[PDB]
Structures are given as structure tokens and as C-alpha cells.
């Protein structure tokens, strides 16, 4: 099953500006049912 991704366990997030090459936001989702 190499053409599937399930984000159903903790994952990391890197939001990147490609014009400035800046990491705008960085984080980790451990439990998405905490707002």
C-alpha cells in the first residue's frame, strides 16, 4: 500500500514561505481533540 497516507497518529507540521524561505509556523499534533 505505497500510495496511501493516513494521518491517524501523531505528526509534525512545518508551514513554509517559499518566497522568503522562512518557517512561518512549526508544530506537532499529538491529540487533535485538544483545541
Amino acid at each position: 500500500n505505497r500510495h496511501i497516507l493516513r494521518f491517524n497518529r501523531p505528526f509534525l507540521v512545518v508551514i513554509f514561505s517559499t518566497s522568503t524561505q522562512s518557517v512561518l509556523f512549526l508544530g506537532k499534533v499529538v491529540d487533535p481533540t485538544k483545541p
Binding site: 505505497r2 500510495h3 496511501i4 497516507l5 493516513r6 494521518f7 491517524n8 497518529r9 501523531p10 505528526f11 509534525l12 507540521v13 512545518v14 508551514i15 513554509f16 514561505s17 517559499t18 518566497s19 522568503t20 524561505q21 522562512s22 518557517v23 512561518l24 509556523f25 512549526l26 508544530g27 506537532k28 499534533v29 499529538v30 491529540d31 487533535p32 481533540t33 485538544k34 483545541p35
Partner: protein, 341 residues
Amino acid sequence: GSLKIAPANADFAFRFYYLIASETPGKNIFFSPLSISAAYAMLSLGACSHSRSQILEGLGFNLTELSESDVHRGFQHLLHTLNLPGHGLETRVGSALFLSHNLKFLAKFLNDTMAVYEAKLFHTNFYDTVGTIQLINDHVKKETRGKIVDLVSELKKDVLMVLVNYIYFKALWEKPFISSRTTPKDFYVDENTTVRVPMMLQDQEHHWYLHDRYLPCSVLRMDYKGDATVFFILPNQGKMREIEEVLTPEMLMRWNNLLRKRNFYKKLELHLPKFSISGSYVLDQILPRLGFTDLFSKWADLSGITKQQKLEASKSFHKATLDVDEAGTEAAAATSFAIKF
């Protein structure tokens, strides 16, 4: 160019992440490194001597390679670029100084913050703690379209200035999800803990992704409409720490460069939660462990702000929020820094 400051800013981003992840493992993390970097670089315009160079070094700047001018002009260009119009992408970054009605601030400091960081100046009465907290927090809330509430959670009566900045980001997916396909699914927090989340689904599009052969993870890069991307990095079950140990600017660039080759652009069945997370940090408690011991000590030289009183650091907060849904991402953050006498 703001390319001269890109290496230091990324270094700081990943140093901050690593500290949080290692000190509070098993917890949601979310922050804006850019907001923190820009706040502290702006603050440094008011620092003198050793204190000025130490803030910039803490932020990752190599002052043998870069001049102070290279740093500040880099931020000016960075912030200008982010604030320019885009079609399916809103980014706004702004700064402000809340200045004591009483005190005489040095014109050079005020001029530099306006010229480089486009700082808005507000005057306030810091004897009115309740009113000043509301004024600052309402400004940040308004600028973040309601997302960052109660940024400044404490304020001492001897504060004479609060620096703030904010970032607001709202961007559409190039490849959005169809919301009729979103349904609740199991999310495995750990071996014993399972929660329910709305899981978005798309399966007709090609996406940029890889299964890393050197590390226990997969990496998806999703493009936004406009000049932004997001990497979603999915460690294999139980391998989050292993990926965190290697999460560096160099690793991000490795993944990015791998995902510039069309053999990593393939059809994908993608299940991604619709969700919100947030982060809330006390930077005055954290940053001494990332190179900022001078700034938060009795020895800090902030005599570029005023000659009228001897100034020291007070509280510094950072809050951030992430909202992911079928149409795109909304992310916001803000940073405060209070100065007392």
C-alpha cells in the same frame, strides 16, 4: 534579499521546537518561529553593547558573517515580502510598541522600529493595568482575526513598554478536499489511547510525498495557492522521538529537495484530519535555555530605549493557533515582550 537571514531564522525555529518537544513530550506544540525572531530582533534595536549581540546570537545570527544592518534590513525585506498582495493567500505580519504616556523614549529607537519593522506606536497608562492589558490584547485579537486572545496574561505595574508582533496566515490548498467525504475516524494518540476526529479524504490527485528510506517516516508536502507550502511529517507509530532528534533545517532541505523530483509526484490516497491545535509559551521562562540568559538577567543593557530609567526585561508571551480544514489552513500567532524599571 531576506535570504541572508534565512539560515539563522530556521536554526532558531528548530532549536525552539527541540527544546519544547524534549521538555514537554507527548503534548501538542504550535508556534511561529518567525514571530518570535522578528519580535526579538526588533527589541534588540533598543539593546546596547553585549546585550544587543547576545540577542542576535541567541536568534542564530553569526555576527562574523552578518552585520547588524544585514539582519535588520533582512527582516525589513522579509516582512515587506510577506505583507504583499496574494491571490489565494493572506499573510500579514505587523509590530507595535505600547509606550508609557510618561516616559521619554529615545527617538532613534522609535525611528528604527518604525523604519524596519513598521511598528505602530500606541501610548498607554501602565498604572491602569486592566485597561492596558485590554488595549494590547484587543489589538492583537483584531489583527489575528480573532484567533489570538489574551496574549498578555500578566502585566506588572512598573512596566513602561510592551513590544508586540503578530502574524496571520490564511491560505487555500492547491488540492483541496471535498467536505462531503469528511467523516469521523480513529486517531491513535499512543498504544493505549484512541480518539475520534473528522478525517478528510482525497484520492484523485497527485501529491508530492515520500517514504523516507533513511528514517522511520513519510513526508507529504502540500502546496497552498500563493507562495507557501506545508510539510506534514508522519513518523511510523512510536517513532516520533526519532524524527524529532533529526528535525533540523538541513533535514527540511533534504526532504524539500527530494520532493522537487517528479518521481515523488504520484497519485495518493490521503486521509488528513480536520482539526485545530494551539500553543502557549512563557518565553521569559524558556529563552534563557536558548541563549538569552543575558537578556533576562539583571545585567541586560536596554539603555537604547530610554536614558530616563534603568530598564529590565519583564514577561514575554507567545501564543499560536492552527486550523486545518478541507479548503485550506489558517494559522496565527503573536509575541509580546514587556520592559519594566
